[PDB]
Design a protein around this nucleic acid. Structure first.
Lengths: 258, 67, 184, 144, 60
RNA sequence: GGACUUUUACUUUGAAAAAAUUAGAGUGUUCAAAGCAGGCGUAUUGCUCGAAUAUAUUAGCAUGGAAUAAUAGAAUAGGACG
RNA sequence: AGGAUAGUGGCCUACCAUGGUUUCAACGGGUAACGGGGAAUAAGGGUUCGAUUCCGGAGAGGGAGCCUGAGAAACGGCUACCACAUCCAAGGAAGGCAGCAGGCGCGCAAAUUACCCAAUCCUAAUUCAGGGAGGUAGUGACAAUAAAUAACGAUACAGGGCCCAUUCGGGUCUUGUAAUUGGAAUGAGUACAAUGUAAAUACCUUAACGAGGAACAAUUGGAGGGCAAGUCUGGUGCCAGCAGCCGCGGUAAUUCCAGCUCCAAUAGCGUAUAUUAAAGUUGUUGCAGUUAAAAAGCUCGUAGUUGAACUUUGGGCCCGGUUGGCC
């Protein structure tokens, strides 16, 4: 329509934000950023509909403007900034550090963690290229573009970063038999320990993946997210660890935790 | 009855953070008087059709309406 | 633009209107359970028909069909929680068989009459709508309740109305003022 | 045999054969043609205003003998001439002439109901005044 | 057709009718009260059970 | 990677198919239509499950099969192994 | 080959070959056609609708053009023409509600020329301002949810078991029948108020006030059938009129018009029109074709649909999973 969009209704906003179909017929549009539109969590929906630390966007703007908040080691004083996958946020108040990861129910969880677990993150390499003047570089899944990494670091690998700079703490390559995390599809939030893969040269590299209950499935190689090696995750993981039990098994779980 | 309660760290904190309607219904402030929203829009359209300060147009309208 | 509020009925009219058998049976039911509306009767029959369709198209399925297991167990759970069904009949065939009479006896008005706070189901109706009642610690003025049996244990008259004290009555105060004036 | 083919790659034959036979069908025809909108007087509308011109004393079809006290009408959006059954007793005296009345159909979808030949329509109002109300004196007509 | 005719006779019997008016009676029960009356008329009231349960017995 | 990979239809499985809607889990809007909230405290620090799941036509990608239907194959062999 | 484009490319030009689509329905016409996500409706299959809250498109009175700009072919921006239409101190000047309200006209058919940015969001240089986007309230019987209009004790009749079987006495208790009578019993509406909300007005709360029916008064259809509900009274006399279909009425009307009674549904009920089921009366599932409508006068024949059988069976050998089956 004659130019960029600026508005966003509810019911075009994604499902997993869990925004309610009442309460005004307009929704918070994620302004552009280092993450996409849909696999992103605005800070407004975060603060206003995950913690209830505020009730209204006016209050949230007060918060963002008084700068209790900071992402990537930076204040990021916008009410609708994309808090994407894996991302880190640090709050002086309560001295908390929340991390933005997924749950198996297909939602952005709220992973309470410490300042060092915030001070490092994870990032999937999106691609690698050679910039001008012969500077090899790569770019991640969070719009971060980084220069002079190891040549051993290639595509589909994952990096662990300092968060005071965009430099590397370490890296993990992609190969058969490594612990991963899923981003896309019915498997949103699974953790399923690569068992093998398949090429289909021409499009849609596919991967057969199963979690420790033997339970297997198949996913796209650009929807997966490698988090390190089998056993140790490089971070702390949320309730469930990407399992997707049955409706009845979860019913029994909660009925035990009545 | 059931509602929402909110205590602040102090009166000044409440005054700065809370809504003006809430403070004035508590009695902590004065509801600033305004005219009709339509009247605000009316004078806005007026001074949108006007350009500049206005003293020159005033003197010109004076010299013209003199006769 | 505001997404429109869903609405959907809770009843269904008779396919064929004038069947004397149908009319007399449902009149018996209305005149015993203290009802005003074939609307209400159709409504309850419609709920029953929905659950019965579910029962049919579930027992169509094999055993250990996890859909059958989950949904049938939840159906059992709500039926025992509401009390139309027993605490020992979970085999789904009793569910095929259950009755509008069962729903009606689990309603509040005739329950009130069985408990004896009415002397007539119609007396229960007028007491309900005049708020001389509360099933828990909050007043209710709806006959159609489908009690959950915790209410049954917790029944009493309205605390904030006579027959549970706390006030003599509107016309009670009226009569008292009348006799005060007479003595005056 | 049976006529209708049965092969697995003859759906074209099936669709076109059925298309022709649906043209032989009734409502498909008028629906796809828009008779209600292009040739019918109303334009497929449920009701229609109209102007009476005169009165008519149509005799009744057999086996019956009466006069049905109908009237002659012209419409406004179209200008086509229509008859309308003043239904009940005295209503003609109620709706004498020049009235900007409202008309509707009978209930047989383009046909006459009883012993009222040539007629598909009846009267329902008089300048915004319903005839049953006039007939039972719950209301009374604007004089002019 | 005889499209014209005796259009003068309209309103004959409705005008000629001898006007009689509705006698008075108390306002009757409404809703469930009326249906209560109907149940207790039809079943516990055995007023007309001769062979086939008429409802408006003409004076017989 | 070199390589012959004669053609299909079919059929199985999976990824994916925007929400709302629909069916449907849980949920006492006082019931209900609804909505997605709620519930529990030592009620001062507070604790806490949720917002499932299913459906998603043809067509498109991969996909195990090789029955069924056709489908060219080396015959006055420019025939394969050589 | 070149030009243009932000970019490929008949997008355009120069030159050249003369091709390209077609019954596997091209092309042309029509469309009360924007499309889809979806809605009604059903055993299945399905048929119909879908402008219409979400997605993508198109448009700003019809057309054309273009500046600015990252982004428009912008129209709540410019230029012209066309049809509209306004103010003129007649020289000239300014516009395009298919934005919110609102008006005329069109009609069968459709709301206030209101309050607020409190929220949902957006925008700017920016927390602070603006926003008929939006929310709020008003009209609102479009559709949906709940559910009042009345009830309860005793007093005159009629019962059903049981006891006495001492007769037809009681009837203990019945459950109704009632120009019986009494209470308590709150609601609708009034609220003082608080609460509600930006401020409110409404809901809930509860004071104070607010029923015995004359009270505070439930209508809409119908009573011959399908189709439940008068062998009731008066009037009418194939007239007036009723009735979807059948039919009623021509001096005893079970249909008409009134009174009474009665049934259906109920703050809704009917009526008219469209559409689905019904409808195996569109028939793929699943129609008919001797006579009920329908087998071409007969034959050939292209596309089309359909098209004889055969080419790997067999057995052994092991393996390990599901189901029961000892324990």
């Amino acid at each position: 329509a004659r130019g960029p969009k600026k508005h966003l209704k509810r019911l075009a906003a994604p499902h997993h934000w869990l925004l309610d179909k009442l309460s005004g017929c307009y929704a918070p549009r994620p302004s552009a950023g280092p993450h996409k539109l849909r696999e992103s969590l605005p800070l407004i929906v975060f603060l206003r509909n995950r913690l209830k630390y505020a009730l209204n966007g006016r209050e949230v703007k007060a918060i963002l403007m008084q700068r209790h908040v900071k992402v990537d080691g930076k204040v990021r004083t916008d009410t609708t900034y994309p808090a994407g996958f894996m991302d880190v946020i640090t709050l002086d108040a309560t001295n908390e550090n929340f991390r933005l990861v997924y749950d198996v129910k297909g939602r952005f969880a709220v992973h309470r963690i410490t300042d060092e677990e915030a001070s490092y993150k994870l990032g999937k390499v999106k691609k690698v290229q050679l910039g001008k003047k012969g500077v090899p570089y790569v770019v991640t899944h969070d719009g971060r573009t980084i220069r002079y990494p190891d040549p051993n670091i290639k595509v589909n690998d994952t990096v662990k970063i300092d968060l005071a700079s965009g430099k590397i703490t370490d890296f993990i390559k992609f190969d058969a038999g490594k612990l991963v995390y899923v981003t896309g599809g019915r498997n949103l939030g699974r953790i399923g320990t690569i068992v093998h893969k398949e090429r289909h040269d021409g499009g849609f590299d596919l991967v057969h993946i199963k979690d420790s209950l033997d339970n297997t499935f198949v996913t796209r190689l650009n929807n997966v997210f490698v988090i390190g090696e089998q056993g140790k995750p490089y971070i702390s993981l949320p309730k469930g660890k990407g399992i997707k039990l049955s409706i009845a098994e979860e019913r029994d779980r909660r009925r035990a935790q009545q | 009855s059931v509602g929402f309660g909110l205590v602040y760290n102090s009166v000044a904190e409440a005054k700065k953070f809370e809504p003006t309607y809430r403070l004035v219904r508590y009695g902590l402030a004065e509801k600033v008087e305004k005219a009709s929203r339509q009247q605000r829009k009316q004078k806005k359209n007026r001074d949108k059709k006007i350009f500049g300060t206005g003293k020159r147009l005033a003197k010109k309208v004076a010299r013209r309406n003199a006769d | 633009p505001r997404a429109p509020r869903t609405y959907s009925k809770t009843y269904s009219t008779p396919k064929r209107p004038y069947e004397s058998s149908r009319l007399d049976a449902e009149l018996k039911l209305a005149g015993e359970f203290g009802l005003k509306n074939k609307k209400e009767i159709y409504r309850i029959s419609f709920q029953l028909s929905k659950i019965r369709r579910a029962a049919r198209d579930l027992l169509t399925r094999d055993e250990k069909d996890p859909k059958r297991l989950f949904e049938g167990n939840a159906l059992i759970r709500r039926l025992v929680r509401v009390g139309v069904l027993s605490e020992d009949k979970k085999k789904l065939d009793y569910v095929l068989a259950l009755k509008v009479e069962d729903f009606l006896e689990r309603r509040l008005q005739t329950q009130v009459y069985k408990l004896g706070l009415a002397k007539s189901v119609h007396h229960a109706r007028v007491l309900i709508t005049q708020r001389h009642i509360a099933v828990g610690k909050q007043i209710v003025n709806i006959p159609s309740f489908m009690v959950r049996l915790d209410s049954e244990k917790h029944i009493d008259f309205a605390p904030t109305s006579p027959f549970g004290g706390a006030r003599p009555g509107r016309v009670a105060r009226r009569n008292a003022a009348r006799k005060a004036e007479a003595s005056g | 045999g049976k006529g209708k083919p049965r092969g697995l790659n003859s759906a074209r034959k099936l669709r076109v054969h059925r298309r022709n036979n649906r043209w032989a069908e009734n409502n498909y025809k008028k629906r796809l043609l828009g008779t209600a909108f292009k040739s019918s007087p109303f334009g497929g509308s449920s009701h229609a205003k109209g102007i009476v011109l005169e009165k008519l004393g149509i005799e009744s079809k057999q086996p019956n003998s009466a006069i049905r006290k109908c009237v002659r009408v012209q419409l406004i959006k179209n200008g086509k001439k229509v008859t309308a059954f003043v239904p009940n007793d005295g209503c003609l005296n109620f709706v004498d002439e020049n009235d900007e009345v409202l008309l509707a159909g009978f209930g047989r979808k383009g046909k006459a109901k009883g012993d009222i030949p040539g007629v598909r329509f009846k009267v329902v109002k008089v300048s915004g005044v319903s005839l049953l109300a006039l007939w039972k004196e719950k209301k009374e007509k604007p004089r002019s | 057709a005889k499209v014209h005719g005796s259009l003068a006779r309209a309103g004959k019997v409705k005008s000629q009718t001898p006007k009689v008016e509705k006698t008075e009676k108390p306002k009757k029960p409404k809703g469930r009260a009326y249906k209560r009356l109907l149940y207790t008329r039809r079943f516990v009231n055995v007023t007309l059970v001769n062979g086939k349960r008429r409802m408006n017995p003409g004076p017989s």
